[PDB]
């Protein structure tokens, strides 16, 4: 349907998959990384009804489905379900056949090896894609943001990777990776709202809480002052409409959940928080690198859309940083949608045509080729 | 029919309210940035003078 | 009631669209004021840098 | 009236209320958590007759009463009814007025605020108790059980708590509030006994099924082979005498009911069941904690009295658990009464005499004080 | 046990603290350089539970503690934690009060001066030691090894200094300090084990990887050849049992961790390694010194435990070293304990009893006195 064998770009995370073609500005479609399955016995006959549902089908029919995510903390653990998600992504909504297009997939630099290897195998064996590449999330964010140097703090649904990059090169000894993510904030919000009389323990309830989080929650610039008021007055509560007509209001819980990014102890995690790890990613780099990383804190990934987060991340690191020097945050309206955007940019670069793995080299090496050719 | 148009009109109210809220959030974000920038443009004009003063001194 | 609710749903489409359009104008206004203050703050940060360069000199 | 100004202890569950004084080894009396009301028009005059009956009065006169439970899955929603149950408990069975004694009440910390706030308020304002203390069910169960470390499985009438404790500390991120309880097991049994030709739909009938469950049911360590035989042979059916002299026999349904705890789909619940929930609470704790919790799964509350339950739980956890390691269950005779026993122990500890809210601090602060003084 | 007022000897690194009485051939007590603190809210009372745990206490109750060490890359950063470690080591384990005994503490010659001042101040002001001396770690390593001449490659947990000594004299212009030690080797392994699917980031997890490193890793005489096989065959994987009964297998990662000693670029360091510094320290020594130091290069401290390191180092130095001359590395059994042993040897010499700072000179001058009195 395209006038060129443009690469397909699929930003497959632990949240939603954003997909479209290289050279465009935006994904053609977005899909929950979900395969749904009925938890009930059918009663009426000739009702259609699938054994399993994919993406938005799984979410739309969720009233009686248990919903599973094949990707956890950035890694595919269930590749049969990813084959279904990709079939849907490519043939039902983008309506393209990867057999005629190179495909670009994304991951964090320390994502366990099985992820990129199984992603490579699925696209070469079930879709028979002519070429593959698995790209770095930080690289993709840097292209989207217009930078070659900076800290990419990618606090999304799966993991926070936090990798410093200078002149387009990794500074791997300074990756302050953290097992704290948007999915934990969602789990925390389900629990804290349960305490308000609105229990959220089932799949339908979990999807509702994620929707509540995305629309009602924030981190603010000053937690203690924000809570001093939110805990004292109803003036800071915000309502939300649930699908069945219930109305829930959230007070200080509205920010106490999200605050776990700065205070991980709220969910039992042992961590300094995302701002200290951002600071250390800069500090652990050489002294002649530090000045450029301080001036370029690059925000990407999920959770970047919480009110007060860009302002707060700059405040928290500038407060740890030395005086005289200027410390700055980069947090464009392209935040979180930067990995997909970077995929489009990267896939299309003329210099990247030497990075793509072809369905030639693949057959001689097998999917393990991804560890020889990508990064 | 009117109800179907109502649902769509209500949907438009919701979509438009969605946009309204989004713009409001952007308005406030930008306005808050405006205000932090008003504070910075002034602090910066003051720095323009503190630095100019450091130069003069 | 439904026609009245269509008129209201439509009114709400118009009101929320109207208001979101007002917010688009308020947003563009604060965005432009932000850009002005940012440009101003940046011109000052550039002057601060010119002075810093001159301070260092 | 006592030989010391000992605290009074009352363990108020969604099922039954256990009460006595601190320092004893048993409650003095147990009452159903029930307030009954006549559903018929009086015909005779000078018949006495109360507006409402409580506890054992409510059960003894139940032939014409509707029986309500003031506690909903651990939360008191009707505090006027609990005040009447408590007055009866304190003045008619314990024969001690709270005005001269501190009182200890219990709840899960998972309880959404209102229960501990109202429990504290009732005792301070309607009973004029000189002091109050709302206790943690896991704490109370571990004291009663002889442990400081382990997981409390309190699978009683209301909600399953499943909270892990290490060296006396809570590990709250691993606590999984579970909507699977003894009350649901009763409802399931009412429906499957209906299929057999013995419908149970009214209050009297609900109380009968609960009595049947308590006396005839078991879980079985191996339910599959047990049902293969129980569903095939009358030789495994047990007769129960109904109040009017009629007899009901129950076969595989006897264990089918308790099995719901391991097969929650039987009541429409989206859950892995109590063995996997316990396992996940162990898993969610740090790796140097996990081994101590695997070796110390502690039974408390109700339903833990079913034959085969200690073995069913230990074997299911062992199956989910890693090799080398020994998985063990502690199942003391202080089962179901363990929260009350723990209350007696805790109320009496010298290290807990500073934990009591006095009837001074209460009035200066109001009932919200329970959030600062108890936990 | 001690029946004489002998000097106490105590070596203190970022890893472990070794202590005992001068005149022996071993410390009588060894503790981790760790002070642990609880990161959880207590619920049970009358449980004991400390504010802080030290040494073996810190590790024994670590399931709910965050564990921190006081010494970083050779220096004390937290004097309060060192006082706790020494208080426990001297009074509880060695059962000795330093008030009645002179004490010998150690550091390499380039160690920042604040470290020597703090060691002196703590023992004189919190322990009231009658006398102090701070000795050179290279001096003590040569005494333990039976040498007066040699190069001490102190590849410990914090920092490696590689200090050359000839006829008992310092050759300070040739000390080639290296920012590579056992603590960094642990970090490398945590990242590579993450690539294998096992994330280790929290305190319990960090302790596991350190334990894995110490028990499973080796240098590899030939890195590339060992890797060609280890990367191709599972027969070279060693299975480590994790505290919860789960296991991890480690393949070429087993040697890639210690390989950082020969490849510091693995952790982002601008260095060729411990063999390069061994070579540079000798290279800058006088031309008529070199022959005696090349025939006596000395391993000291830990990381020398690698059964691959003995041949790996002599091969790497021999390759750079001059012809005609005998090139040899001394890898004594007094390894990982050589500084303490040397400390005993120095502390007990009759020729060393005039080297002590007394608790007279100390108070008149203050702790800066160590800078003039020791070396």
**In this structure, what CATH number is given to the domain that contains residue E102?**
3.30.420.40
User: Where in the sequence is the domain holding E310, given as residue range(s)?
Assistant: 136-181+271-332
**Collapsing DSSP states into helix, strand and coil, what is residue A18?**
strand
Q: How many C-beta atoms surround the C-beta of residue A362 within 10 A?
A: 23
Counting Cα atoms < 13 Å in the Cβ hemisphere of A276 gives 11
Parallel/antiparallel/unpaired status of strands D103-107 and D131-136: parallel
For residues A78 and A152, membership in a common domain is answered with no
Report residue A188 CA to chain centroid gap. 18
Q: Which of E216, A191, A149 is nearest to D284 (CA)?
A: A191
Cβ-based neighbours of A93, under 8 Å, separated by 6 or more: A19, A28, A29, A31
CB A204 within 8 A of CB A210: no
b/e code A232-250 from CB counts within 10 Å (16+ = b) = eeeebeeebeeeeeeebeb
- At A259, list the tokens: 């605050």
Counting Cα atoms < 13 Å in the Cβ hemisphere of E165 gives 23
Residues in a beta bridge with A16: A32
Interchain contact A197–D (C-beta under 8 A): yes
Parallel/antiparallel/unpaired status of strands E247-250 and E238-241: antiparallel
> Which residues of C fall within a CB distance of 8 Å from B24?
23
In Å, how far is B11's CA from the nearest CA of chain A? Answer: 15
User: Is E268's CB within 8 Å of A171's CB?
Assistant: yes
Chains touching D, CB cut-off 8 Å, 3+ pairs: A, E
Q: Please give the helix or strand (H or E) that residue A17 lies within, else none.
A: strand A16-21
b/e code E266-283 from CB counts within 10 Å (16+ = b) = bbbbebbbbbbbbbbbbe
Q: How many C-beta atoms surround the C-beta of residue A211 within 10 A?
A: 14
Cβ-based neighbours of A2, under 8 Å, separated by 6 or more: A21, A96, A101
Proportion of chain D in helix, strand, coil states, percent, rounded to 5: 40, 20, 40
How does DSSP assign D178-242, residue by residue?
Answer: B---HHHHHHHHHHHHHHTT----SHHHHHHHHHHHHHH----S-HHHHHHHHTT-GGG-EEEE-
Interchain contact E38–D (C-beta under 8 A): yes
Which residue of chain C comes nearest to B10, CA vs CA?
C9
For residues D141 and D288, membership in a common domain is answered with yes
Counting Cα atoms < 13 Å in the Cβ hemisphere of E247 gives 10
Cβ-based neighbours of A276, under 8 Å, separated by 6 or more: A316, A320
- CA torsion D87-D89-D94-D95 (nearest 10°) is 30
For residues E149 and E50, membership in a common domain is answered with no
Which residue of chain C comes nearest to B3, CA vs CA?
C2
Backbone φ and ψ of E151, nearest 5°: -110, 125
Task: Write out residues 247-276 of E within 8 Å (CB-CB) of A.
Answer: 267-269
> Which residues of A fall within a CB distance of 8 Å from D172?
268
Report residue A164 CA to chain centroid gap. 18
How does DSSP assign A33-70, residue by residue?
Answer: S-EEEE-S---SSS----SSEETHHHHHTGGGEEEE-S
CB A65 within 8 A of CB A51: no
Of E38, E62, E245, the CB nearest to D288: E62
- Among A14, A44, A68, residue at a domain's last position: A68
For residues E12 and E116, membership in a common domain is answered with yes
Give the whole-angstrom CA distance, residue D51 versus residue E335: 86
Q: Please give the helix or strand (H or E) that residue A193 lies within, else none.
A: helix A182-194
- At D228, list the tokens: 């293969």
For residues E144 and E98, membership in a common domain is answered with no
For residues A16 and A89, membership in a common domain is answered with yes
Count of domains for chain D? 4
Tell which of A183, A189, A191 to mutate to test the D interface (max D CBs under 10 Å). Answer: A191
Residues in a beta bridge with D66: D37
Interchain contact A214–B (C-beta under 8 A): no
- Please state whether at least 3 CB pairs lie below 8 Å between chains D and B: no
- At A289, list the tokens: 């690198």
- Among D217, D242, D267, residue at a domain's last position: D267
CB E141 within 8 A of CB E342: yes
Tell which of B7, B23, B24 to mutate to test the C interface (max C CBs under 10 Å). Answer: B23
CB D309 within 8 A of CB D298: no
Cβ-based neighbours of A60, under 8 Å, separated by 6 or more: none
In Å, how far is A369's CA from the nearest CA of chain E? Answer: 14
User: Is E196's CB within 8 Å of A112's CB?
Assistant: yes
CATH of the domain at A220: 3.90.640.10
Give the whole-angstrom CA distance, residue D151 versus residue A334: 46
Proportion of chain B in helix, strand, coil states, percent, rounded to 5: 95, 0, 5
CB A235 within 8 A of CB A87: no
Residues in a beta bridge with E329: E297
- Among A68, A89, A115, residue at a domain's last position: A68
User: Is D286's CB within 8 Å of E202's CB?
Assistant: yes
Counting Cα atoms < 13 Å in the Cβ hemisphere of A70 gives 26
For residues D15 and D92, membership in a common domain is answered with yes
User: Is D173's CB within 8 Å of A267's CB?
Assistant: yes
Interchain contact A170–D (C-beta under 8 A): no
CB D148 within 8 A of CB D165: yes
Give the whole-angstrom CA distance, residue E267 versus residue E285: 29
How does DSSP assign A194-230, residue by residue?
Answer: HTTT----SHHHHHHHHHHHHHH----S-HHHHHHHH
Chains touching B, CB cut-off 8 Å, 3+ pairs: A, C
Give the whole-angstrom CA distance, residue D8 versus residue D27: 10
| DSSP code at position A142 | H
Residue E341: C-alpha distances to residues D36, E146, E158 (Å) = 82, 11, 20
User: Is D172's CB within 8 Å of E46's CB?
Assistant: no
Which residue of chain D comes nearest to A184, CA vs CA?
D173
How does DSSP assign A225-245, residue by residue?
Answer: HHHHHHTT-GGG-EEEE-TTS
For residues D211 and D250, membership in a common domain is answered with yes
In Å, how far is A5's CA from the nearest CA of chain B? Answer: 36
Which residue of chain D comes nearest to A198, CA vs CA?
D112
- At E41, list the tokens: 């809210």
Q: How many C-beta atoms surround the C-beta of residue A29 within 10 A?
A: 17
Proportion of chain C in helix, strand, coil states, percent, rounded to 5: 95, 0, 5
Tell which of A72, A77, A110 to mutate to test the E interface (max E CBs under 10 Å). Answer: A110
CB D345 within 8 A of CB D136: no
**Collapsing DSSP states into helix, strand and coil, what is residue A188?**
helix
Please, where are the H alpha helices in chain E?
Answer: 56-60, 79-87, 114-125, 137-145, 182-195, 203-216, 223-230, 253-256, 274-283, 290-294, 309-318, 338-347, 361-365, 370-373
How does DSSP assign E261-302, residue by residue?
Answer: GT-GGGGT-SS--HHHHHHHHHHTS-TTTHHHHHTTEEEESS
Resolution value in angstroms: 8.3
Q: How many residues comprise chain D?
A: 375
- Three-state SS string across D35-95, please? EEEECCCCCCCCCCCCCCEEHHHHHHCHHHEEEECCEECCEECCHHHHHHHHHHHHHHHCC
For residues E50 and E102, membership in a common domain is answered with no
Cβ-based neighbours of B28, under 8 Å, separated by 6 or more: none
Q: Which of E128, E90, E135 is nearest to E363 (CA)?
A: E128
Tell which of E68, E184, E197 to mutate to test the A interface (max A CBs under 10 Å). Answer: E197
Interchain contact E191–A (C-beta under 8 A): yes
Q: How many residues comprise chain C?
A: 57
Interchain contact A361–B (C-beta under 8 A): no
Experimental method of this PDB entry: cryo-EM
Parallel/antiparallel/unpaired status of strands A35-38 and A53-54: antiparallel
For residues A252 and A220, membership in a common domain is answered with yes
Q: Which of D136, D149, D128, D16 is nearest to D70 (CA)?
A: D16
> Which residues of B fall within a CB distance of 8 Å from C34?
30-31, 33-34, 37
Of B6, B40, B54, the CB nearest to C41: B40
CB A327 within 8 A of CB A320: no
For residues A223 and A151, membership in a common domain is answered with no
Report residue A88 CA to chain centroid gap. 20
- At D32, list the tokens: 């159903």
| DSSP code at position D349 | -
Give the whole-angstrom CA distance, residue A239 versus residue A237: 7
In Å, how far is A315's CA from the nearest CA of chain D? Answer: 29
For residues E169 and E295, membership in a common domain is answered with yes
């Amino acid at each position: 349907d395209e006038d060129e064998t443009t690469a397909l770009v699929c930003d497959n995370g632990s949240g939603l998959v954003k997909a479209g073609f290289a050279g465009d500005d935006a994904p053609r479609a977005v899909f929950p990384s979900i395969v749904g399955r009925p938890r009930h016995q059918g009663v009426m006959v000739g009702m259609g009804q699938k054994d399993s549902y994919v993406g938005d089908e799984a979410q739309s029919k969720r009233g009686i489905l248990t919903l599973k995510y094949p990707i956890e903390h950035g890694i595919i653990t269930n590749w049969d379900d990813m084959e279904k998600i990709w079939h849907h992504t490519f043939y039902n909504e983008l309506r393209v056949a990867p057999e005629e297009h190179p495909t670009l997939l994304t991951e964090a630099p320390l994502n366990p090896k099985a992820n990129r290897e199984k992603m490579t195998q699925i696209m070469f064996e079930t879709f028979n894609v002519p070429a593959m590449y698995v790209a770095i999330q930080a690289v993709l964010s840097l292209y989207a943001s217009g930078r070659t140097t900076g800290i990419v703090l990618d606090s999304g649904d799966g993991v926070t990777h936090n990798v410093p990059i200078y002149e387009g090169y990794a500074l791997p000894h300074a990756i302050m990776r953290l097992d704290l993510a948007g999915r934990d904030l969602t789990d925390y919000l389900m629990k804290i709202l349960t305490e308000r009389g609105y229990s959220f323990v089932t799949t339908a309830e979990r999807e509702i809480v994620r929707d509540i989080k995305e629309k009602l929650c924030y981190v603010a610039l000053d937690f203690e002052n924000e809570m001093a008021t939110a805990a004292s007055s109803s003036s800071l509560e915000k309502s939300y409409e649930l699908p069945d007509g219930q109305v829930i209001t959230i007070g200080n819980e509205r920010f106490r959940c999200p605050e776990t990014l700065f205070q991980p102890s709220f969910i039992g995690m042992e961590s300094a928080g995302i701002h200290e790890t951002t600071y250390n990613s800069i500090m652990k780099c050489d002294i002649d690198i530090r000045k450029d990383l301080y001036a370029n804190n690059v925000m990407s990934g999920g959770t970047t859309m919480y009110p007060g987060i860009a302002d707060r991340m700059q405040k928290e690191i500038t407060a740890l940083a030395p005086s005289t020097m200027k410390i700055k945050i980069i947090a464009p309206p392209e935040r979180k949608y930067s990995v997909w955007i970077g995929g489009s940019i990267l896939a299309s670069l003329s210099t990247f045509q030497q990075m793509w793995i072809t369905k030639q080299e693949y057959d001689e090496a097998g999917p393990s080729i991804v560890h020889r050719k990508c990064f | 029919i009117i109800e179907s148009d109502l649902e769509r009109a209500e949907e438009r109210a919701e979509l438009s309210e969605g946009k309204c809220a989004e713009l409001e959030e952007e308005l406030k974000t930008v306005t808050n940035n405006l205000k932090s920038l008003e504070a910075q443009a002034e602090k910066y004009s003051q720095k323009e003078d503190r630095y100019e003063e450091e130069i003069k001194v």
